[PDB]
Design a protein around this motif. Structure first.
Motif, PDB file in Angstrom:
ATOM      1  N   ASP A   1       0.856  -1.174   0.000  1.00  0.00           N
ATOM      2  CA  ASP A   1       0.000   0.000   0.000  1.00  0.00           C
ATOM      3  C   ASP A   1       0.898   1.232   0.000  1.00  0.00           C
ATOM      4  O   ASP A   1       2.106   1.103  -0.200  1.00  0.00           O
ATOM      5  CB  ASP A   1      -0.971  -0.025   1.180  1.00  0.00           C
TER       6      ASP A   1
ATOM      7  N   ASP B   1       1.324   3.735   2.459  1.00  0.00           N
ATOM      8  CA  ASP B   1       1.508   4.314   3.782  1.00  0.00           C
ATOM      9  C   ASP B   1       2.980   4.417   4.160  1.00  0.00           C
ATOM     10  O   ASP B   1       3.311   4.434   5.352  1.00  0.00           O
ATOM     11  CB  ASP B   1       0.747   3.500   4.835  1.00  0.00           C
TER      12      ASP B   1
ATOM     13  N   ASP C   1       5.492   2.331   2.413  1.00  0.00           N
ATOM     14  CA  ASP C   1       6.216   1.156   1.940  1.00  0.00           C
ATOM     15  C   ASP C   1       7.383   1.553   1.034  1.00  0.00           C
ATOM     16  O   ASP C   1       7.390   2.625   0.424  1.00  0.00           O
ATOM     17  CB  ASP C   1       5.274   0.208   1.180  1.00  0.00           C
TER      18      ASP C   1
HETATM   19 MG   LIG Z   1       2.123  -0.577   4.227  1.00  0.00          MG
END
Ligand SMILES: [Mg+2]
Ligand SMILES: Nc1ccn([C@@H]2O[C@H](COP(=O)(O)CP(=O)(O)OP(=O)(O)O)[C@@H](O)[C@H]2O)c(=O)n1
Ligand SMILES: [Zn+2]
Lengths: 147, 221, 94, 170, 56, 55, 110, 1112
Positions: free
Chosen positions: D118, D120, D122
DNA sequence: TGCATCCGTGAGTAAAG
DNA sequence: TATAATGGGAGCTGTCACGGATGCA
């Protein structure tokens, strides 16, 4: 896996279970050099039993063995794979006393030596394939046609 | 067309229990001992929880966080063990020529012990899809020939035949019964599931097996 | 997706054999300065630089587009290796 | 540990095609550096390899034409993106790199599921397959757009999800 | 109404019947239009969207 | 030749001596002033080899 | 001295020695630059005659690793030491001219 | 603006000093202000009293200690990489017993680090924080035996490393065992050694189920205490000659020596309370009048037998109860390391006492201070609990100072920590926050002190409650332990009161944590505030009651990661705690007394106080923190301002007029946007970069040494070989870059030359030299350049040289140069944003303003969050915040909404109504009717059930605005968003995870020594790790050649990597690889273990992978 | 022929540190 | 290169489960 809603084909579990059933225990050596209670691969004991029946000798009585996944991995033939897994000094002392040769059948052994693994583009089934255009192919068929 | 409703219904976001916690009630809660509180959280997240409700819930939250934390390590260890047992298993030839096979059952004894009832569709699919028939099958006026790779439609057909009482188990080539040394043959393995077609000789099938069993490991509750 | 990948997988008995054929053909092209290509001038893969369209420099793109034509033969034990090497050096030098 | 490898934060980039990712220009300059030195010498950008390397050593020395040369280097080539944990084989996938300004890798939406990625925070790692053989393997066997079904279940793995499903449903 | 399961089945059927090249094109098209429409659809979340039912 | 197998076995004292290029007789590493290896110590160039190529 | 296996960080994860780069072995850039230097030197020596190129290679050590004296190169070619020094000088002069003209060896001087 | 606040709970007491745990712990352990004679036997004073006197004959006794003044102040220590510390002197006297001679002296023991005003330390120039540790409190416990149900284990636990654990157990054979140092022996023997006789044990234990007979052994009573003592010494020391004085010494040191055995004072108290007895010292027994006298053993045995039989008033103990776990704060941990250093010093003292010219032995001749110095230096530099201080923002430091760890020296090993330790116990209520813990491996092991919690002198965490007498709520506050708390029925802080009287018939309360509905007659205490259940960070989350705990955790933690912004703002929705956090963290500056402000400057504020005195506060300006964030104070008063005591003088970093300002107030639209906010990504407006929102100042420090070599000196110089003036443009005369320059990657910051390693030039080098006729210079360029992907503006240079005043470097270095480089970081694609509710995401797209969705009046939104992030995460609080933010946008006000006691939906609806009037009546006056697109959106909304049919356009827009939703126009088309969209003001922070710091790439670079594999890490120009699982990924694809590249050409095939680089720069295909060097290392490391490893061919004939280089 | 008991061994990836 | 000197200190501890070898009755 079903309880958590994970769809997963039986193939994969079957591969693993098949490795779990890889070995067998001797119950009567028959006409063999083996010992009662000795543990060995089912393939090797079947090959021996066919060689003894083809020789007219008494076959080896053997019993199926189920070992879990760790012990199956440690008991494998390739000492490079087993030593890189776990229990390194034990694997290594037994293999060195036995003078084992690792034939490099698997993927770990070849990875350790930086060799080209025996899978995918490394499979003997495909890596020897050749490519040639029809121009060069006919130019070479002419050279084979002259001599 | 309420946004929570649409998102949950479509599969875009959310499940019924989260939407319930948003709109209905938060529900029963666990003590640290796993035993449940007799008094539920009657508030939803819209209404707002009380200090006591929030605290009562933090037990279960922390328990689940610690569960995930301690589970990822055990899953990773399991995957590494599976990789070490299966890694030499490769598709090494097209057919070992075995005559052995396994019979996937389509029925299972009812927990009532009353009779046999049809297995779940997904279960039969995960047992049959992409496998090679070890024997001729003749059901519902169709010939499924020995050597055939079972397409998904072939599977739904066999489910129909079972529903019509024409078959209880399907014979199928399987790595359990393959005789290829140091690996597996093509007919015994079946589909490269990632391609919906027969597997290519050379596929690192054991590694794929380990990764397929291991990758959902951290979802096992 | 690679242009025509489904037909390419249709050509071989194993996907990995397709990869070996493509990689060997690409090395054949790089070693002989593309002089051995079975593509006509219009079938040449082009690259749009600032100046204009130029020959695609990617030997693998070339090898796949060649494979798609049928003008290539692949298999095991078609010719001794040194005979192939020397015949290609004769027909197309370095 | 390995050469011709980098890593950066990932970012969605919905305009990409399935076989594509967004590779930041500076990452690409370093990951493809020998190729770039060679191609710079092929054009007029530098007399030889060593002059080209000295020219790239300082950032204020780097001129526009070199970037165009980079585009000729990477043409048709693919790079491997990887996200840890590599739980199964789709934790590595091959993409045709689309150069971008900025410092973030752009990751196609439809592959996030397979990576469990995702946005956030990464990060993913990039790897450059060097040889013709490795490049052919990546382009045929590991390309994103060739790996659409799950090897484990056989069901589609690259498929519509959150916003895609939402708009279609609506 | 197209949802997660029916779109998954569309991708699988398209795979079997048309190949991974055309299925990849289909996937990109689905992505394009799903994103476009979800932008202008009006989808949002305010607190009055968590509708407490009267039966509670 | 091509590597095909890898054997592992116990090594005899004679085998271990066949490997050795010299016996390490002193428990000394390098000289505190020269910063060069000590004679018959763990880093001796007489045993293990030159520190600089062809010198 | 300090231990190469000194812990870094609070896990059992990294050793202090893991951050020490090897200065001894040449880098791929270094090996490649040496290779391109040797090849460009042979390129520039092929613009001389065989004798002046051989005299330069003998007097600078590219043949057997060592530098020969004027008397040794003169005894090998069968000339006087003044003559061998003179043909070394004219070889160097031709190399200087070719280098000013093509500039193919400047960048290797760092 | 106006600050309206909600809430109906008056907080009797304020929050305590938030760093009091740190500061007070250290103050107590040092006693520096106490005159020596008045000190207590605690802290380092107690350590001194434990170590001294030192005997055997000579004796060295301790009179007192004293701490001098610090040699340098805190800022000077931060600069000079020094430790902020005080000299420690101890007054000692030597006495020869026979001679009677008494020599006295004050000896110097080195330095002790001092704690700064805010509770931190300065070790070697870097701020550090000692983290409090949680552990099992000493005492006597009774736990169930996990094998035998009806049996129980008695455990006797002293302080860590202050004696052995002792277990008592009732064996299957009936005899009572005692496990000590892992040795099981019958307790009867030790009972005999204590002087107990069968008569006394029979009359003390006969009552219990005949169990006392398992204690009856005739062979034990048949011998006197001495014979049993020698029997025990033989049972505990196999092989040691059982001498009499040897056995007495061993048993005394094991069971009664207060210098070897030590229950805590807390262990003492808890044993007293559990066993219902009284203790003389902190040991289990004593040596009195030549014999041993029991203190604890018989009470413990009595309790054990009583619990086993089942007599009432005996219960097994919950070892995770916060009445059995205590905290070891800074002072106790440092005191323990001090005690160890002192023990080593005493060993050295006795060593020197035995030998030496005993006529002339002073205290100075006997004390080697080095072991003590080393123990303290170790504790402060390399302890697991001595952590690099987190000063990203001031809340970072505060939270760091208030953290509790269960790891570290004397604590738990990870993977040895099951569910139990990590659980939130019921007794955590009010003491340890239930949400502020890490996600991942450390979850439940690192926690935070609750906001009202204090640690008492025994180390247990205490929380405050109000006294309730006859339904009347006093203002008398009582701080309780969990043990004390369990005795009462404690009501909830929100129970409705008229005046001081409980106004509700049914009252929600707790009894031993259990929730219960109770009448006001039964209520004994009442919570002080909801704030007391959570940490400081969690208490900063408005509408916390509407957020799932899993996401509250994230928002809580991520406030610690907020980067101080040059235009930082306090949130438009606050919890009311934002000012205390600025004040207690010593971020901002305040007025010490009432006064008038004399001078105001970018650098200093001068205040005239009521005493007529002039006080000058200098301002810290653009200082570099541990994490590289900028820490500058800015003045907020003006010349001539009247200021009362405690009024703000200067705003610290991340402070806006004394309010905690961790981010920006932006205008948010909650809608999807063309996939650019798919899966938590965020879309922002370029208008944020335009007006320098989310812009932050960052300082990096670069350092270089010039040292003496065996080949000649390094020297900082401008004279660097083979470089143009273009390369040396911004270098000053001495070789250091000039303050103010703009430095990009590759630019020199400090010139340095190093003498070349001894080298015969390769014949190629000699010929190239002859061709170019230029001598090779003696030195080489070793200058400090800017690393890849860094740079900025030079703002400071420090230069220290050997031979300069006040300067002395470590042996060898001639000079040290430090360059500080500043950079102004605008927000960019890749940077990380988050709000206080756990919504986090990475900026994926920055659109130009004309693409941003805008309100009908032309105002574009700032950021676009995706609604798919809410439902799965259940953090509805960010929604309510947005709603309230909307009202605040148009009323021009901010709000204070206490957690669990804040703004509810109806009051937000009132505010929204007022705002809608400001938003739309303006329009109606200015002469514009409802827009056609507004009508279309109203039709759509009418079908959605959001507005009632038949109302006017204005009435329906007001209905939507009351739901927080507005009409929104697409900037790209001018057509409306088909639905009304939730738009409002949200507080969003820029986190420390910026992409500028993380992007990294490498073609070739440094390799490791033994493995010859690439180094790791961006700082080392390292390669990515392609580990075991990445290998599996490549295997499962059948990418044999890609994988073999990873294993050979790109890592440690030396010939392979060289040849690959050469082929690529030439334009050839890469060669086939060869053996990886680490496999050769494996072969040689197996040979080192006497294992012959042989690579063979198919003919079983050896193959040499060493190419002959190691075969004679 | 069966049990208790003890000792050894292993317990996720990448990042920074 | 010469009084006589004659047996040591530190443990340090909230898993955990398995597998396989030893120990008793
Ligand atoms: Mg993540
Ligand atoms: N210690 C750690 C921490 C992180 N990770 C990796 O990072 C992700 C965190 O998931 P996540 O918690 O972010 C899934 P979320 O986005 O919250 O909800 P969703 O299901 O609705 O999408 C995981 O997929 C892991 O692969 C790990 O392997 N070990
Ligand atoms: Zn088979």
């Amino acid at each position: 896996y079903r309880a958590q809603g994970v769809k997963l084909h039986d193939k994969h579990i079957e591969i693993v279970v098949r490795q779990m059933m890889k070995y067998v225990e001797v119950t009567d050596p028959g006409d063999s050099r083996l010992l009662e209670g000795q543990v060995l691969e089912k393939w090797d004991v079947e090959a021996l039993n066919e060689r003894l029946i083809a020789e007219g000798k008494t076959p080896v009585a053997w019993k199926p063995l189920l070992m879990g996944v760790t012990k199956s991995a440690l008991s494998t033939k390739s000492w490079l794979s087993a030593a890189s897994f776990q229990n390194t000094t034990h694997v290594l002392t037994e293999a060195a006393i036995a003078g084992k040769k690792d034939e490099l059948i698997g993927l770990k052994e070849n990875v350790i030596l930086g060799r080209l693994i025996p899978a995918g583009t490394g499979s003997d089934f495909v890596r020897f394939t050749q490519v040639v255009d029809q121009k060069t192919l006919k130019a070479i068929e002419e050279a084979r046609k002259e001599a | 067309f309420n946004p929570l409703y649409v998102m949950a219904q479509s599969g875009a976001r959310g499940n019924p229990q989260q939407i319930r916690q948003l709109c209905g009630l938060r529900g029963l809660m666990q003590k640290p001992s796993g035993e449940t509180f007799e008094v539920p959280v009657r508030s939803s997240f819209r209404e707002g929880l009380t200090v006591l409700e929030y605290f009562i819930s933090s037990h279960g939250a922390r328990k689940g966080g610690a569960d995930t934390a301690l589970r990822t390590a055990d899953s990773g260890y399991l995957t590494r063990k599976l990789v070490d047992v299966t890694h030499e298993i490769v598709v090494r030839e097209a057919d070992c020529g075995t005559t052995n096979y396994i019979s996937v059952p389509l029925f299972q004894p009812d927990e009532v012990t009353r009779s046999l009832r049809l297995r779940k569709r997904a279960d039969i699919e995960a047992g049959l899809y992409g496998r090679v028939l070890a024997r001729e099958v003749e059901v519902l006026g169709v010939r499924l020939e020995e050597g055939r790779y079972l397409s998904m439609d072939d599977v739904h057909l066999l489910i129909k035949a079972a529903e019509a009482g024409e078959i209880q188990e399907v014979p199928v080539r399987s790595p359990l019964t393959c005789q290829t040394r140091y690996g597996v043959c093509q007919k015994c393995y079946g589909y490269d599931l990632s391609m919906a077609r027969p597997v290519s000789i050379g596929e690192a099938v054991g590694i794929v097996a380990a990764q397929s069993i291991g990758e959902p490991g951290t979802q096992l509750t | 997706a690679e242009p025509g990948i489904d037909k390419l997988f249709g050509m071989v008995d194993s996907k990995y054999r397709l990869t070996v054929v493509v990689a060997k053909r690409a090395q054949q092209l790089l070693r002989h300065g593309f002089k051995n290509t079975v593509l006509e001038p219009e079938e040449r893969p082009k690259m749009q630089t600032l100046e204009g369209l130029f020959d695609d420099p990617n030997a693998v793109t070339w090898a796949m587009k060649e494979l798609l034509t049928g003008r290539l033969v692949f298999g095991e034990n078609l010719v001794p290796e040194d005979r192939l090497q020397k015949e290609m050096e004769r027909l197309y030098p370095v | 540990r390995v050469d011709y490898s980098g890593r950066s934060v990932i970012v969605v980039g919905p305009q990409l095609k399935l076989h594509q990712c967004g590779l930041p220009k500076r990452m690409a300059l370093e990951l493809f550096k020998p190729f770039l030195l060679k191609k710079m010498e092929e054009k007029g950008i530098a007399p030889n390899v060593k002059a080209a390397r000295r020219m790239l050593e300082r950032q204020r020395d780097i001129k526009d034409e070199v970037w165009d040369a980079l585009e000729e280097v990477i043409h048709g080539k693919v790079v491997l993106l990887n996200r840890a944990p590599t739980l199964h084989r789709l934790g590595i996938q091959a993409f045709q790199p689309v150069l971008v300004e900025g410092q973030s890798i752009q990751l196609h939406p439809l592959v996030c599921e397979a990576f469990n990625a995702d946005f956030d925070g990464d990060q993913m790692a990039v790897h450059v397959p060097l040889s013709s053989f490795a490049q052919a393997e990546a382009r045929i066997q590991m390309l994103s757009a060739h790996n659409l079904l799950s090897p484990a279940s056989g069901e589609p793995l690259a498929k519509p999800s959150r916003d895609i499903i939402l708009g279609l449903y609506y | 109404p197209q949802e997660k399961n029916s779109l998954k089945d569309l991708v699988y059927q398209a795979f079997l019947r048309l190949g991974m090249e055309k299925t990849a094109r289909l996937l990109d098209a689905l992505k394009y239009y799903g994103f476009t429409f979800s932008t202008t659809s009006g989808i949002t979340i305010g607190i009055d969207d968590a509708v407490i039912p009267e039966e509670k | 030749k091509e590597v095909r197998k890898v054997r592992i076995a116990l090594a005899s004292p004679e085998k271990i001596r066949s490997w050795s290029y010299g016996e390490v007789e002193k428990p000394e590493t390098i000289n505190y002033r020269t910063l060069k290896p000590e004679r018959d110590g763990l880093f001796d160039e007489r045993i293990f080899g030159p520190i600089k190529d062809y010198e | 001295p300090v231990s190469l296996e000194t812990p870094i960080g609070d896990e059992k994860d990294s050793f202090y020695g893991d951050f020490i780069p090897d200065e001894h072995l040449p880098s791929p850039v270094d090996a490649a630059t040496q290779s391109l230097l040797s090849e460009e030197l042979e390129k520039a020596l092929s613009k001389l005659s065989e004798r002046e190129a051989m005299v330069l290679k003998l007097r600078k050590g590219l043949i057997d690793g060592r530098e020969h004296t004027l008397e040794e190169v003169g005894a090998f070619f069968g000339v006087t030491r003044e003559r061998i020094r003179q043909i070394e000088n004219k070889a160097l002069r031709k190399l200087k001219y070719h280098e000013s003209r093509t500039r193919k060896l400047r960048d290797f001087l760092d | 603006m106006e600050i309206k606040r909600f809430g109906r709970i008056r907080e009797v007491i304020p929050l305590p000093p938030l760093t009091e745990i740190q500061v007070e712990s250290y103050r107590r352990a040092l006693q520096a202000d106490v005159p020596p004679e008045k000190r207590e036997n605690v802290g380092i004073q107690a350590a001194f009293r434990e170590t001294f006197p030192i005997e055997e004959g000579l004796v060295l006794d301790f009179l007192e200690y004293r701490l001098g003044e610090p040699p340098f102040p805190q800022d000077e220590c931060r600069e000079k990489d020094l430790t902020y510390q005080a000299p420690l002197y101890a007054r000692l006297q030597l006495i020869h017993k026979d001679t009677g001679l008494i020599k006295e002296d004050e000896v110097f023991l080195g330095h002790i680090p001092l704690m700064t005003e805010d509770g931190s330390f300065i070790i070697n120039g870097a701020d550090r924080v000692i983290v409090s540790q949680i552990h099992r409190s000493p005492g006597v416990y009774f736990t169930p035996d996990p094998a035998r149900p009806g049996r129980y284990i008695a455990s006797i636990i002293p302080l860590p490393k202050r004696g052995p654990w002792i277990d008592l157990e009732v064996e299957p054979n009936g005899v009572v065992s005692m496990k000590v140092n892992k040795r099981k022996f019958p307790l009867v023997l030790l009972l005999r050694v204590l002087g107990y006789d069968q008569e006394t044990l029979a009359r003390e234990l006969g009552a219990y189920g005949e169990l006392v007979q398992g204690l009856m052994d005739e062979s034990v009573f048949a011998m006197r205490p001495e014979e049993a003592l020698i029997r025990l010494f033989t049972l505990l020391r196999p092989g040691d000659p059982p001498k009499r004085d040897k056995a007495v010494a061993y048993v005394y040191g094991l069971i009664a020596d207060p210098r070897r055995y030590d229950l805590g004072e807390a262990g003492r108290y808890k044993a007293e309370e559990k066993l219902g007895i009284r203790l003389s010292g902190r040991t289990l027994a004593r040596f009195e009048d030549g014999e041993f006298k029991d203190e604890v053993f018989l009470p413990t045995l009595r309790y054990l037998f009583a619990l086993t039989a089942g007599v009432p008033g005996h219960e097994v103990d919950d070892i995770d109860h916060l009445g059995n776990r205590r905290i070891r704060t800074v002072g106790e941990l440092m005191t323990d390391q001090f005690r160890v250093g002192l023990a080593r010093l005493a060993r050295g003292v006795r060593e020197r006492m035995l030998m030496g010219s005993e006529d002339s032995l002073t205290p100075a001749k006997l004390v080697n201070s080095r072991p003590l110095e080393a123990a303290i230096r170790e504790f402060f530099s390399r302890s697991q609990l001595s952590q690099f201080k987190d000063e990203t923002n001031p809340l970072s430091s505060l939270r760091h100072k208030r953290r509790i760890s269960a790891l570290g020296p004397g604590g738990l090993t990870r993977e040895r920590a099951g569910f139990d330790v990590r659980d939130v116990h019921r007794t955590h209520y009010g003491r340890i926050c239930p949400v502020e813990t890490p996600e991942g491996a450390n979850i439940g092991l690192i926690t935070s002190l609750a906001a009202y919690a204090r640690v008492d002198e025994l180390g247990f965490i205490r929380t405050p409650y109000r006294r309730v007498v006859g339904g009347v709520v006093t203002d008398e506050v009582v701080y309780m332990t969990a043990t004390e708390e369990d005795r009462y029925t404690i009501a909830q802080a929100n129970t409705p009161l008229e005046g001081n009287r409980i106004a509700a018939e049914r009252v929600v309360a707790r009894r031993k944590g259990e929730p219960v509905i109770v009448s006001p007659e039964e209520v004994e205490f009442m919570d002080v505030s909801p704030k007391q259940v959570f940490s400081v960070n969690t208490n900063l989350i408005p509408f916390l009651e509407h957020d799932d705990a899993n996401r509250a955790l994230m928002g809580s933690n991520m406030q610690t990661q907020a980067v101080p912004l040059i235009r930082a703002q306090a949130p438009v929705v606050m919890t009311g705690l934002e000012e205390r956090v600025v004040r207690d963290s010593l971020a901002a500056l305040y007025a010490e007394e009432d006064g008038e402000v004399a001078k105001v400057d970018g650098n200093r504020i001068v205040v005239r106080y009521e005493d007529g005195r002039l006080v000058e506060y200098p301002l810290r300006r653009f200082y570099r923190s541990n994490q590289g964030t900028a820490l500058d104070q800015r003045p907020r008063v003006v010349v001539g301002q009247r200021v009362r005591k405690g009024d703000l003088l200067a705003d610290g970093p991340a402070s806006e007029n004394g309010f905690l300002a961790l981010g920006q107030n932006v205008l948010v639209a909650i809608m999807p946007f063309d996939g650019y906010n798919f899966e938590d990504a965020i879309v922002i407006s370029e208008e944020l970069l335009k007006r320098d929102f989310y812009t932050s100042i960052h300082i990096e420090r670069y350092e270089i040494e010039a040292r003496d070599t065996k080949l000649g000196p390094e020297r900082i110089t401008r004279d660097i070989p083979h470089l143009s003036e273009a390369a040396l443009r911004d270098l000053d005369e001495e070789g250091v870059v000039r303050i103010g320059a703009e430095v990009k990657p590759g630019d020199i910051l400090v010139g340095r030359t190093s003498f070349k390693g001894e080298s015969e030039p390769t014949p190629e080098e000699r010929l190239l030299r002859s061709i170019f006729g230029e001598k090779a210079r003696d030195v080489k360029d070793t200058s400090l350049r800017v690393p890849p992907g860094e740079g900025g503006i030079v703002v400071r240079t420090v230069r220290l040289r050997r031979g300069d005043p006040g300067v002395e470097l470590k042996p060898g270095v001639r000079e040290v140069v430090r360059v500080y480089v500043a950079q102004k970081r605008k927000l960019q694609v890749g940077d990380k944003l988050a709000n206080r509710h756990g919504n986090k995401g990475v900026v994926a797209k920055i659109l130009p303003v004309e693409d941003m969705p805008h309100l009908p009046d032309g105002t574009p939104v700032d950021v676009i969050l995706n609604p798919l992030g809410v439902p799965s995460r259940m953090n509805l609080g960010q929604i309510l915040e947005t709603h309230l933010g909307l009202a605040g946008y148009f009323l021009g006000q901010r709000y204070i909404s206490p957690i669990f006691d804040g703004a509810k939906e109806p009051e937000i609806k009132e505010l929204l109504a007022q705002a809608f009037e400001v938003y739309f009546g303006k329009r109606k006056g200015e002469g514009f009717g409802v827009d056609k697109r507004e009508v279309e959106v109203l039709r759509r909304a009418e079908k959605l059930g959001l507005v009632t049919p038949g109302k006017t356009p204005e009435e329906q827009l007001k209905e939507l605005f009351l739901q927080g939703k507005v009409v929104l126009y697409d900037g790209r088309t001018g057509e409306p968003i088909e639905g009304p969209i939730v738009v409002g003001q949200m507080f969003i922070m820029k986190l420390y995870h910026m992409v500028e710091d993380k992007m990294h790439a490498r073609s070739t670079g440094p390799y490791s020594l033994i493995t010859q594999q690439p180094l790791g890490g961006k700082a080392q120009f390292g390669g990515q790790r392609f580990g075991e699982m990445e290998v599996w990924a490549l295997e499962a694809y059948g990418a044999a050649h890609t994988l073999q590249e990873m294993l050979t050409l790109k890592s440690d095939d030396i010939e392979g990597r060289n040849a690959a680089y050469e082929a690529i720069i030439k334009g050839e295909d890469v060669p086939e690889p060869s053996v990886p060097e680490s496999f050769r290392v494996l072969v040689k490391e197996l040979q080192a273990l006497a294992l012959d490893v042989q690579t063979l061919d198919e003919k079983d004939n050896p193959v040499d992978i060493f190419e002959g280089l190691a075969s004679k």
